[PDB]
Each structure stands twice: as structure tokens, then as C-alpha cells.
Design a protein around this ligand. Sequence first.
Ligand SMILES: CCn1cc(C(=O)NCc2ccc(F)cc2)cn1
Length: 164
Amino acid sequence: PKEPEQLRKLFIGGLSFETTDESLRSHFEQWGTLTDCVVMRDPNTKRSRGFGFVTYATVEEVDAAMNARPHKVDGRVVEPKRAHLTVKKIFVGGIKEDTEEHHLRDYFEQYGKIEVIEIMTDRGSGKKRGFAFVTFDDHDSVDKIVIQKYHTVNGHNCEVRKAL
Ligand SMILES: CCn1cc(C(=O)NCc2ccc(F)cc2)cn1
């Protein structure tokens, strides 16, 4: 049963205008089977629009490609993104008053490198408010997190969203 195609796509920005379907494919095939690979071009001039997309056979292959950044394709460092509000911070709700830093860290560190964990407390009483913010060193962590249907931390079913 294949993962939805949308979750297997990488948008690739910042291409060299000399990158082609073939050279984009030869590069990104290093990290998995590509079912699709397209450079976007002007319909009249055929001049590159400077971005394209690749579709892998599996989500684990998307992960491998993102873990191999930075990608230099035909001499230029490109910008791959999954299926954009590009942020490095998430809101984590529903953690109640018994969730601590290490609960959040042990779970979220497997999505990416954590730089900040902020467990929110009441300005007047100091009591925990039941939500937190986690800041990562890179946006792909957040992108992986927010497409999951479920997040379970410290036994709690959590609501997780991009934080701006
Ligand atoms: C950057 C992450 N991301 C990109 C999309 C996307 O659909 N790309 C926009 C686009 C596609 C083709 C065009 F011709 C013009 C614009 C979705 N998420």
C-alpha cells in the first residue's frame, strides 16, 4: 500500500537554469527510486523557471534526500522542501500539567535537532498551562511533524501545529 504521492514529493527551488529533467533525476536518484522528475519551464521560451519537483517511491526515500542536504545540483545549492509556510517552531498542545522537558525532547529529537523547548507557565501563578513550543534548527523537522495524523507524548494525544 503506497504512501500518498503528495507525501513523496520534493519541491526543489533555486535550480540552475541549466538543470534539466535528466540532470535533476541523475542527482536525486542517489537517494531513492524516482517515479517523477520535472524541471518547470516557460511554455513559450522553454527557459527554466528555476524550480522543479521530484517524486520518490517512498517517504523514507524523501527522508534520505532531505538528510543529504545541502544539495549542489549542476553547481548550485538548491532548496528542497516537502509538500509553503517554512518555519522551525511548533506549538504542542494538550500536554497538561505533568509533561516535562525530557518528555518533549525524547520524542521530538527524532524529528530533528532541537534548539529550544519552552514549556508554558501561567504568568501569575507559575502553573503549567498545558502547552509548549519546540524550536528546531531546520524546517524539515517541522514539516515531517505536522503531516502526521497523531502525536503521543507522555501518554497524551497532542495537538501539534506550525508556530509563527
Ligand atoms: C515548497 C513546498 N511546496 C511546493 C508546492 C507546490 O505545489 N508548488 C507550487 C508550484 C508548482 C508548480 C508551478 F508551476 C508553480 C507553483 C507545495 N508545497
